[PDB]
Amino acid sequence: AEKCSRCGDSVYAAEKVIGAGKPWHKNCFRCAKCGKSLESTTLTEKEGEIYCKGCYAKN
């Protein structure tokens, strides 16, 4: 029972995903480090949050 303050849609049981703690969407992925915008339903979640593959892409 919460509202994804990313896109702006309330959710609790749908396309939401568990970011090891925080509720998100399969597109509302916001990197915990580079804060970059990460769309699409494909990324990674860890460290109690969710990180972007774009980070591990830089190296």
Instruction: State whether residue 36 is helix, strand or coil.
Output: coil
Tell me the closest approach of the beta carbon of residue 25 to Zn ion, in angstroms: 3
Q: Which residues make Cβ contacts (< 8 Å) with residue 1, sequence separation at least 6? A: 12
Give yes or no for a contact between 19 and 52, defined as CB atoms under 8 angstroms apart: no
Cβ-based nearer residue to Zn ion, 7 or 18: 7
In Å, the largest CA–CA distance within the chain is 37
- Which residues would be at the binding site for Zn ion (CB under 5 A)? 4, 6-7, 25, 28, 31, 34, 52, 54-55
At closest approach, how far in Å is the CB of 21 from Zn ion? 16
To Zn ion, the closest distance from the beta carbon of 44 in angstroms equals 10
